[PDB]
Each structure stands twice: as structure tokens, then as C-alpha cells.
């Protein structure tokens, strides 16, 4: 009905990023696990885990968001700029999920960048954007994003959305646990 | 009413790019004209000219779109990553507008990137996006973009939108002339 900025954000994210990165994602993780060391087999997960914090807060470093999340390595490149699409290549990060001072899991992990736009709008007066407005568009962003992936060809299979909202007060939340739950699940 | 992907695209473009680049645009052009050579005064225009082709076609190189548009130089950097915003710095291009094999004008010039998303959607089956759909969203993108700039603080003053549509057949159009008209105008 109204403006609904989320719809545009979701499509740009998929068309301009997800669809270009996802196809070769499995291969780049295979390279890290099997072809970057002859003494050990890597155990990096097979999917791109996309953090979708409804509050749209996106820290520069994951560890600060949670100490139990630690940067491990850069996802190896392919490498091919001219495969057709061009934007390639892209920088991606592998993280180890700590639990009891012990590595519980490992995976390529990142926030949904468009949420920065959402966050920035709410902090921009001319936008007339409130907290609830941000939440509304954030939820919407996820809904339309997963709607897109469903119609996608296996792109949904190389990818998983981790949407979550933290309580406002007396808030006990563990990002790593949230991710782990997802990793562990399969 | 409906999805209207343009609204999101316009806001992301302004919030994530225009608003970060525009503020220091005047200074970077002042640097090129006055502080990059002690033998001559540069004559680069004072505004960022944004190409808004309604057909959403965005060539890698401007000259191919028109031979009379020639890359001249990179817009000098500031340079400051941590001014608050971070994405900075950004690469920008200065172009000379030829006319009769003679330089008629010179300015920092670039396409509105989000139009690539529009173009890409129309070429994506699952989107259910037609030519007219692309045009509709393209026009909409410009409308909401200029709506944003109007409420902006002088950002509109350091910037100018060049929206244009080319005829389908027997099409005689000169991009350089279009830009020049704009430059000349002031």
C-alpha cells in the first residue's frame, strides 16, 4: 500500500549479491576444507549463514556482538571477475563458534547489509522513520527475501536466514548459540 | 499499493551513497582544479551529474555509450575512512564532453547504479518483470529520488539528475549533448 522500502531492499540484495555469490559458494568452501592444507580436513559448513537482526544493528566486528564468535579466516576466492557477472570477487569471512572456551562449530557468516540502510533511515529525521517502522520493514525484508529464495534454483539450498529479535530489558541472548543451533541442526 | 521496488532502491542509493559522497564532493573537485597542477586552473563542474536512463542500460564505459564522452581523470580522494561514516572512500570519474572534436565541457559523471538492479530484474524470469515494468519503476525511482533530495540539506545543490529516455526506432540521441545542455545551463 504505502512506501514499503523493504521490498526494494530485498530484491537488490538478491539480484546484486546473493545470486552472484551463492552459485560458487560451495566450491570456495570445498577449497578451504580440502585444498588449503594437506595435514587436515577443514570442517566449514556448506551454507552461507545470513544474520538478520530485526533491530538492524550491524557491528563492525562479530566478536563484539559476541565474544564467542571469532574470526577464523577469509573465504578463499575463485577467482573470476569475467564469468559473466562482474562484481565478483567478494570478501567473505569464516567464523568459529566458541562454547565453553571450546570450538563448537565453524562457518561462513555475515549480516544482511541492507539492514544498515534500515538502521540509517531511522536515524535520519527527514525519513520520518521510527523504531517500529524499522522493525516493520525489517520483518518485511525477511518475508520478501525468503519469498524470493523459494522460487530460486538451489540458491535457497546454499543459504540460510537467521532472523532474530533481542528482548529490550533483562535481555539474555547468545548469538553463537543461535547460530550453533542452526549449524547443529544440520 | 503493490511492491514498488523503486522506493527501496531510491532510499538505499541516497542513504548508502549520495549522502556520504556529496558533502565532500565540492572539496574534491576544488582539489583537482586548483591543487593538482601549478601551471593551469582546472575547469571541472561543481556538481555530480547522475545519469538516469529510463531504459536502465548501464554500459561499462561511457565512451561506448557515446564516443564524445571521454574519461579524463579520477576524482582525487580526501582522504578519510573514519570521518564517521565508513564506506568512504569512493572512486569517481571526470569526463570531457567532446563536440566537433573539441572539448566543450568537463565534469564528474556516473550512472545511477540501482538501475542495474532494475535492468537485471527484467531479465530474471521469477521476477515477472517486463519492459514496461522496468520503465514504470525507473520513472518511479527518479520521482522518489528527487523527492528525497528536496528535503536534503544542500545535497540537492551538489548534484543534478539527468533523466532521459531514448526513442525505440530511428533513434537520434546524443548523451553528450544532453549533458552539455545541462552543464552549459550553468
From Swiss-Prot, chains A, B:
Changing residue 113 to A: Strong decrease in c-di-GMP-binding. Disulfide bonds: none annotated. Changing residue 3 to A: Partially constitutively active mutant that promotes the production of type I interferon in absence of cGAMP ligand. 2',3'-cGAMP binds at residues 12, 17, 88, 113. The modification Phosphothreonine is found at residue 79. It comes from the Eukaryota. Changing residue 92 to A: Strong decrease in c-di-GMP and cGAMP-binding. Changing residue 90 to A: Abolished cGAMP-binding. 3',3'-c-di-GMP binds at residues 12, 17, 88-91, 113. Belongs to the STING family. It is linked to STING-associated vasculopathy, infantile-onset: An autoinflammatory disease characterized by early-onset systemic inflammation and cutaneous vasculopathy, resulting in severe skin lesions. Violaceous, scaling lesions of fingers, toes, nose, cheeks and ears progress to acral necrosis in most of the patients. Some patients have severe interstitial lung disease. This is Stimulator of interferon genes protein.
